[PDB]
Design a binder for this molecule. Sequence first.
Ligand SMILES: O=P([O-])([O-])O
Length: 375
Amino acid sequence: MDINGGGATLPQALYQTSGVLTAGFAQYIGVGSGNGKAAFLNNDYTKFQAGVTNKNVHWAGSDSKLSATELSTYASAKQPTWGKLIQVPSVGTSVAIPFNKSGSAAVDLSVQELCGVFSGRINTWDGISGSGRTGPIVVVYRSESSGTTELFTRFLNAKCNAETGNFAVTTTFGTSFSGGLPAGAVAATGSQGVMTALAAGDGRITYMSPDFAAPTLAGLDDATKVARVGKNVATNTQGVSPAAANVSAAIGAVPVPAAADRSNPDAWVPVFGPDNTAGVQPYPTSGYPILGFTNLIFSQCYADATQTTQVRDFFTKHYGASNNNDAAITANAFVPLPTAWKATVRASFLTASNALSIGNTNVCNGIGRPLLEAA
Ligand SMILES: O=P([O-])([O-])O
């Protein structure tokens, strides 16, 4: 019998790569970050497989952080019997801007053009300078509670200061902008469902996992298909692509979680945000600007000893110095964590004497998420 994870679609092809998940892990089920969080927090397998109730949920992938309410509800309802949850970064990621509008000219968005496209202010292809293109822009967005949406709206919230309204940080893009969606915007479900929709009408644009924004990695560098971001015509500056190499320096510069705050799951997930605001990292000035982390949610404790070992063995691989998942991470258009980040994750969640460690024989004595499923 296996343990069950799922959630965020942004990293699902990574978790579905052979060998990334270790022994005892069922194949990852991509359903969106909101569904993944709900699956874990409520131990509700139907959020992974509709109509299927005879399994427990053991972990989730999410690119949406746990909210204050999610955390407090779990702490009061579940932690006394199941133990503390763990929320940790998995990999760093860009957010790509694929589009379906032919032409050999490179599409290179200034940040303010990106803002105007997603606010509806710029709604024709000839409103993007240097595009070579004409006709209407149709924005495709995620219908459901999405961590890609959260990562993207953090950027819009930080940068888009010149619209007729403001972008809120949210998991539901349809309500992010206080002035509404652009006329004609199209909703679709999942990373893959959005990419299918992008192709279902001409002149469409979206925001997307770099692992799905192009069929091949090198395709992230094709500016006839995946927009460059960061143009500044006044200074004669080209934007760059969402390839992992263009966000990896910025990911690597993100500070490890503050030592005295490590018992708070919120402290483990870095977020980017507005400039000169303590507690959030500013978006990078160099390289590709739209980035963040995708995360993993586990329990510290499982009533079953085999489940506990299985989970530890995954952390040993995914956060290991050797025999790790970094090659697969890169192959999936993502950024590995540096050594000091891996070491910090291991020190809290693997090293046995740490109060936070998975399966700690003192802290987890007699407790943990259940073996059997109960209705
Ligand atoms: O699916 P997502 O990753 O949540 O966007």
